[PDB]
Amino acid sequence: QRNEEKAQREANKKIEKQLQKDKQVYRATHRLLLLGAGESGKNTIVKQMSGIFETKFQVDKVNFHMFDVGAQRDERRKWIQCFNDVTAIIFVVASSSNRLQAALKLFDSIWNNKWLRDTSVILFLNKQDLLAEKVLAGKSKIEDYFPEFARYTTPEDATPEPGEDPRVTRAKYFIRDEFLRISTASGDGRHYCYPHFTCSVDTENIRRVFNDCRDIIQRMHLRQYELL
Amino acid sequence: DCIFKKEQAMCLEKIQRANEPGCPGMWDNITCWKPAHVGEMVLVSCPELFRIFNPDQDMGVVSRNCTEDGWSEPFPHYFDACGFDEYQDYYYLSVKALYTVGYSTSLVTLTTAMVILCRFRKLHCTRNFIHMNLFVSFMLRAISVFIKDWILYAESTVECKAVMVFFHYCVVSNYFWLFIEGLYLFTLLVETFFPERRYFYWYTIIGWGTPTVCVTVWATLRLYFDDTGCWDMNDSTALWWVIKGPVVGSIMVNFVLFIGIIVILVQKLQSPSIYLRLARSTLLLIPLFGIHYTVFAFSPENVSKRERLVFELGLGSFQGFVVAVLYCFLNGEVQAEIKRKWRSW
Amino acid sequence: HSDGIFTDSYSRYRKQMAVKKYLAAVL
Amino acid sequence: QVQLQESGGGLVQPGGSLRLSCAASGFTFSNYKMNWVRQAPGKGLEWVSDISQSGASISYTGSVKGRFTISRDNAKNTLYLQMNSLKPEDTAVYYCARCPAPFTRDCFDVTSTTYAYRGQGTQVTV
Amino acid sequence: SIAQARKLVEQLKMEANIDRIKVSKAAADLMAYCEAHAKEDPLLTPVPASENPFR
Amino acid sequence: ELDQLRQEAEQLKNQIRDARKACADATLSQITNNIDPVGRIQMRTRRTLRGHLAKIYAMHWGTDSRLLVSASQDGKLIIWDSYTTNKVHAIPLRSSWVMTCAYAPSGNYVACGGLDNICSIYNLKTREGNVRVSRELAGHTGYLSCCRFLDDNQIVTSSGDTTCALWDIETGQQTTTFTGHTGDVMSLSLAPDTRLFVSGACDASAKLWDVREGMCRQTFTGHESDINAICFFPNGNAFATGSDDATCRLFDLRADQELMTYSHDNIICGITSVSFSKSGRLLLAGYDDFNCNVWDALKADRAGVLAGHDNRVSCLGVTDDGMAVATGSWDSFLKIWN
């Protein structure tokens, strides 16, 4: 009957208006997946800025939405597919540790996933001060865990901070190169990795993720136009 | 018979009624004269029909003498000396055929590309909408050019003035949409965050309405001040500049935006092969933004008009075809969709 | 723009040719 | 169902050589990447090596690079592991894990506990 | 653990306790059920556009 | 000792395999070799639904075969009218990561859940006229993967903590828990009599559960990879499963063994959804390669392809009366075929 159709049309119009407002709100925010291990120290990063935890932070009046994994199991095979539309994956790894090989394998699995092929990864090599003091101590080596470290030299394009001995610079750049070796093996233009040497108490992490998200969006726009 | 010969007849009656002899006010197919004394020099100016030969310089030095029963003929060449020049068709015809061929090819290819884009629901985004608007602008330009050629040359009425206004509107709209392409891409690259603020609505308004204002102002100015012929000549420099100014402004602003986009692109490329990629990207960007218009944009029309027209028409009428083949048929997403649909069939 | 320049030039050329033919016929 | 059974292992003096074989049943062995996972006593699971579907790409962990070699023959549906110089810290339990999905390069959750497609494992001591 | 193995063997015993019918009988029953509802399947047999709500 | 129990379990599994082999002489394709094929099925899209923003994971038909429900990653739950394609309700969600939804048989309730490990129950017959959450079930550990209503007071849920649970809506407590799976339980289906229900986990095993006693009756192991979708045959004595090895398999409760597999060489992608028709002759299975396939259940021969989806198909459902089949996908579009 006509009145029933009129009522359904009115309800549809109201729902469509509300959905338009929700679309305008949704398109503004960027979703980020914070991934890491227990030793990675991502909890300190969250504190600086249930089953799943979310945090809302704004950088230059831009809304970001970061989703910590929360209280899930250690099997990420199935639930990792839900995050194929996020802007970037903030991969946090402790660089003072064999946890490093496990992190490398996890990064390789993420990078080669079919559903995650388009998604980009932001890499945080955390625990830099701990790694520095461990290397200065010299009790624990990296050559024993990684035999390739003996035949590795600091890249000529490296830009170490002043007052830093080459011993820790070479080690941290070796770890960064180990991650970039997996990063550049595949994903030729589909997605990119952005390594950053972040300390646990660094206040610039928000700026780093802001700039990396800007770069990711710019590269996606260029790729859509076939300019890149 | 035509109308320009009636102007002599228009002054025929006026002088024949005024004449009724020191010397009779005879009339020829050139001018209308006035009676005077016997042997007295009479100086008149050759009519506006002689002004078409020398628009830049104006003079009316024509003289005759009277006798007891008429006028002598001692200045036969003075009519040629007034306005007639002292001494092109192949060039004009070749250029005309060339841009007709180019516009036809561009129209066909753009129609195919527009059908392909509209038929796929997946290929529906803001970028493709701007591309569709640009394609429609090229189609309108080509149609207006064909109509104007048919009305003016193949066959002054009020209809042909409307054709002229529509033609000018189509051309200015195509130029403004070429500018809008670059403006939108620059906005996307610069203001990546909060990028969608109904910019499509404002861009459509400005692109399809800014030409309306300029063409209406130009038409009103022509109606009040210079309503000569079918409005197909631009003797008045200011009224021509009314149309021409926004076009060159759009060209220069689009060139600036193209430079900015190239700067951002080269910064992306050199992040921690590059020359080849930059050259390829620039070659793809040139037809989209109409960068080739910048070569002759600031040169005066007199300075090398021949090559200017040959280039910007013969090689500028294929711009629609080039942008259609580059951004629709050679597009990766469109090719993937086409092959997927073919496999489904 | 190029289309307007070409239209103006061609129309002026046709007008000049027509006036020249008219003058040749009458003179 | 999927059944992975390991072979070999035992007690060998340091510097000896050991051979590990894994017998696979219940699936097409030529469509899955294969893995070796070691569990040190008192520690968690650790990844050792992996081999592609056809054996083209082979990877090893750093601690055993150039000392352990892995091989597979799809005709007999068997996965191998060769040990050359058993250092004293190699004493652990070894499993021949399988990549969860076929025709893929990502092998998630292989080193995770309670993984479905893992064998009972063999104990090696030095 | 020992408890996990105990639960596994107990569950296996419980599952093995059951009895199974012949597979041919089950296949025949499935075939008969499918053939008894051939006329009642809108997707299997074409439906006139007048009756179809999604015309 | 662990070794003795391992050996005893191995020999018990061997005995079960021997019994299953002894209880099989002819395959399903060997007894239906004489029946006529259904022919090519030229199903085409009749309605298209374009209200969602992000990808679609779940949808459930109403018992009236007219209303519909859908959940998407933008935290939106939308109730459709399939006849007129008019949205009836739009329920915002507290958690935007939802992996399942269910529509109550009485039509008075709708449920959803996901990465928040919480099943939320919504009442559509509220007095205030505004749909609000009525009960939250927060006893699960891992992500909630699927949920199905038994009635307005009992709901069964399967989560990523390798357990299935039976809930009491009024009290909110977990009345009965089902354990035995060694992997993530991806989906479950309810028998027509609502006395038993099967569950497909990530360990390539399907288990038949008894709701009243809470124990596990049978276990079916024929797949090679993790199982994504499962659905009972309309007769109630069979069900079909879909895994990531590009194979759909049909099992039997009475014979306790596999009868038929639905595989093709050109198919190497995973399977996300499986459903039957009213008569059970047609088996519909959504695939990862952006399209669905229709399988003749009695002949294992493909009879139709529904290739109208741009992105991955993740959910599928057939109306109770069988008039139409709806298919959501990751491109935020629902297409109703017929």
Complete edge-to-edge strand list for the sheet that includes strand B41-44: B41-44, B62-67, B70-71
**B124 touching F, CB under 8 A?**
no
What are the residues whose beta carbons fall under 8 Å from the beta carbon of F256, sequence distance 6 or more?
A: E18, E20, F20, F23, F218, F220
What are the residues whose beta carbons fall under 8 Å from the beta carbon of A72, sequence distance 6 or more?
A: A51, A52, A79, F115, F142, F143, F160
**F30 near E28, Cβ under 8 Å?**
no
Spatial distance between the Cα atoms of A42 and A123, rounded to a whole number of angstroms: 12
- D18-25/D78-83 β-pairing: antiparallel
**F293 near F282, Cβ under 8 Å?**
no
What's the farthest any 2 CA atoms get from each other in chain B?
100
State which residue of chain C sits closest to B241, comparing Cα positions: C1
**D83 near D92, Cβ under 8 Å?**
no
CA distance B202 to chain F (A): 24
Residue whose structure tokens are 């799943």: A52
Would you call F150 exposed, middle or buried from its count of C-beta atoms within 10 A (0-12, 13-18, 19+)?
Answer: middle
Helix (H) or strand (E) holding D124: strand D122-124
Residue whose structure tokens are 């006010």: B25
Spatial distance between the Cα atoms of F110 and F133, rounded to a whole number of angstroms: 10
Question: Do the chains contact at B189 and A27, CB–CB below 8 Å?
Answer: no
| Neighbors of chain C by Cβ distance (3+ pairs < 8 Å) | B
User: What DSSP character marks residue D55?
Assistant: S
Rg, C-alpha atoms of chain D: 14
| Neighbors of chain E by Cβ distance (3+ pairs < 8 Å) | F
Alpha helices in chain F (DSSP H): 2-22, 28-31
**SS3 for F273-307, per residue?**
EEEECCCCCEEEEEECCCCEEEEECCCCCEEEEEC
User: What DSSP character marks residue B152?
Assistant: I
Instruction: Report the residue from D61, D106, D110 with minimal CB separation from A101.
Output: D61
Q: What amino acid occupies position F48?
A: T
**B45 near C8, Cβ under 8 Å?**
no
Start-to-end CA span in chain E (Å): 61
Q: Helix (H, G, I), strand (E, B), or coil: what is residue A8?
A: helix
**F338 near F282, Cβ under 8 Å?**
no
State which residue of chain E sits closest to F318, comparing Cα positions: E43
Complete edge-to-edge strand list for the sheet that includes strand F248-252: F227-232, F238-243, F248-252, F257-262
Q: What is the DSSP string of A162-185?
A: TT--HHHHHHHHHHHHHHHHHHHH
Q: Helix (H, G, I), strand (E, B), or coil: what is residue A116?
A: coil
For F51, the token pair is: 């209200």
- The residue among B93, B91, B102 whose CA lies nearest residue B315 is B102
- The residue among A82, A100, A113 whose CA lies nearest residue A190 is A113
Instruction: Report the residue from F90, F92, F115 with minimal CB separation from A79.
Output: F115
Q: What amino acid occupies position A6?
A: K
CA distance A136 to chain F (A): 42
**Number of domain units in chain E:** 1
- For an interface test with A, give the residue of B130, B134, B193, B281 to mutate (most A CBs within 10 A): B193
Q: What is the DSSP string of B53-79?
A: T-SS-----EEEEEETTEE----STHH
**F82 touching E, CB under 8 A?**
yes
- The residue among F191, F193, F188, F257 whose CA lies nearest residue F227 is F188
Q: Helix (H, G, I), strand (E, B), or coil: what is residue C1?
A: coil
Neighbour-count burial for B129-152, b at 16+ CB within 10 Å, e otherwise:
ebbbbbbbbbbbbbebbbbbbebb
Tell me the chain F residues in contact with residue A8 when contact means C-beta distances shorter than 8 Å. Answer: 81, 84, 86, 88
Spatial distance between the Cα atoms of A90 and A30, rounded to a whole number of angstroms: 13
**F184 near F202, Cβ under 8 Å?**
yes
**CATH number of domain containing E50:** 4.10.260.10
Would you call B4 exposed, middle or buried from its count of C-beta atoms within 10 A (0-12, 13-18, 19+)?
Answer: middle
Chains F and E in direct contact, meaning 3 or more beta-carbon pairs closer than 8 angstroms: yes
CB atoms within 10 A of CB B50: 24
Cα distances (Å, whole numbers) of residue B168 to A140, B142, C1, F228: 79, 12, 9, 62
Provide φ and ψ at B149, rounded to 5°: -60, -45
Question: Do the chains contact at E43 and F322, CB–CB below 8 Å?
Answer: yes
For B293, the token pair is: 């218009």
**E10 touching F, CB under 8 A?**
no
Spatial distance between the Cα atoms of B240 and B250, rounded to a whole number of angstroms: 16
**F70 near F324, Cβ under 8 Å?**
no
**CATH number of domain containing D50:** 2.60.40.10
| Neighbors of chain B by Cβ distance (3+ pairs < 8 Å) | A, C, F
What are the residues whose beta carbons fall under 8 Å from the beta carbon of E9, sequence distance 6 or more?
A: F5, F8, F9, F12
For F228, the token pair is: 């994504």
- For an interface test with F, give the residue of E30, E37, E52 to mutate (most F CBs within 10 A): E30
For A114, the token pair is: 């079919």
Range of the structural domain that residue D28 is part of: 3-124
**A214 touching D, CB under 8 A?**
no
Q: Helix (H, G, I), strand (E, B), or coil: what is residue F266?
A: coil
**B285 touching A, CB under 8 A?**
yes
For B46, the token pair is: 């050759």
> Quick one: residue F300, left, alpha or beta (phi over 0 = left, psi -120 to 50 = alpha)?
left
Tell me the chain E residues in contact with residue F13 when contact means C-beta distances shorter than 8 Å. Answer: 12
> Sign of torsion, CA B3 B5 B9 B15?
positive
| Neighbors of chain D by Cβ distance (3+ pairs < 8 Å) | A, F
**Number of domain units in chain D:** 1
What's the farthest any 2 CA atoms get from each other in chain F?
65
Spatial distance between the Cα atoms of B7 and F308, rounded to a whole number of angstroms: 72
Spatial distance between the Cα atoms of C16 and C22, rounded to a whole number of angstroms: 10
Complete edge-to-edge strand list for the sheet that includes strand D45-51: D58-60, D45-51, D34-39, D92-95, D122-124
Q: How far is CA F288 from the centre of its chain?
A: 16
Q: What is the DSSP string of A19-79?
A: HHHHHHHHHH-EEEEEEE-GGGTHHHHHHH----EEEEEESSS-EEEEEE--S--S--TTG
Experimental method: cryo-EM
- Strand ranges (DSSP E) for A86-155? 88-94, 120-126
Neighbour-count burial for B60-92, b at 16+ CB within 10 Å, e otherwise:
eebebbbeeeebeeeeeeebbebbbeeeeeeee
Question: Do the chains contact at A226 and B332, CB–CB below 8 Å?
Answer: yes
Spatial distance between the Cα atoms of D75 and D58, rounded to a whole number of angstroms: 19
Tell me the chain D residues in contact with residue A144 when contact means C-beta distances shorter than 8 Å. Answer: 63
Provide φ and ψ at A124, rounded to 5°: -115, 115
Q: How far is CA D45 from the centre of its chain?
A: 12
- For an interface test with C, give the residue of B54, B311, B312, B319 to mutate (most C CBs within 10 A): B312
Alpha helices in chain B (DSSP H): 6-19, 78-82, 89-119, 126-149, 158-190, 199-224, 237-269, 274-289, 305-309, 319-324, 332-344
Rg, C-alpha atoms of chain F: 20
- For an interface test with D, give the residue of F205, F207, F245 to mutate (most D CBs within 10 A): F245
CA distance B320 to chain F (A): 30
CA distance A107 to chain F (A): 22
State which residue of chain F sits closest to D116, comparing Cα positions: F203
For C24, the token pair is: 């040749």
**F252 near F238, Cβ under 8 Å?**
yes
Cα distances (Å, whole numbers) of residue A19 to B125, E51, F86, F114: 18, 34, 13, 22
- What CATH number has the domain spanning F2-337? 2.130.10.10
**F283 near F234, Cβ under 8 Å?**
no
Spatial distance between the Cα atoms of A33 and A85, rounded to a whole number of angstroms: 10
Domain ranges (residues) in chain F = 2-337
For B21, the token pair is: 């002899």
CA atoms within 13 A on the CB side of B42: 24
- The residue among A172, A170, A54, A186 whose CA lies nearest residue A124 is A172
Spatial distance between the Cα atoms of B275 and B282, rounded to a whole number of angstroms: 10
Spatial distance between the Cα atoms of C26 and C14, rounded to a whole number of angstroms: 18
Would you call F30 exposed, middle or buried from its count of C-beta atoms within 10 A (0-12, 13-18, 19+)?
Answer: exposed
Chains C and F in direct contact, meaning 3 or more beta-carbon pairs closer than 8 angstroms: no
CA distance B289 to chain C (A): 15
Spatial distance between the Cα atoms of F287 and D78, rounded to a whole number of angstroms: 31
Would you call A89 exposed, middle or buried from its count of C-beta atoms within 10 A (0-12, 13-18, 19+)?
Answer: buried
Spatial distance between the Cα atoms of B229 and B235, rounded to a whole number of angstroms: 11
Rg, C-alpha atoms of chain C: 12
- F317-318/F325-328 β-pairing: antiparallel
Q: What amino acid occupies position B283?
A: L
Q: What is the DSSP string of F5-30?
A: HHHHHHHHHHHHHHHHHHT-SS-HHH
Chains E and C in direct contact, meaning 3 or more beta-carbon pairs closer than 8 angstroms: no
**A123 near A89, Cβ under 8 Å?**
no
Tell me the chain B residues in contact with residue C14 when contact means C-beta distances shorter than 8 Å. Answer: 153
Range of the structural domain that residue E42 is part of: 1-55
- The residue among D87, D91, D111, D107 whose CA lies nearest residue D99 is D107
**E37 near F279, Cβ under 8 Å?**
yes
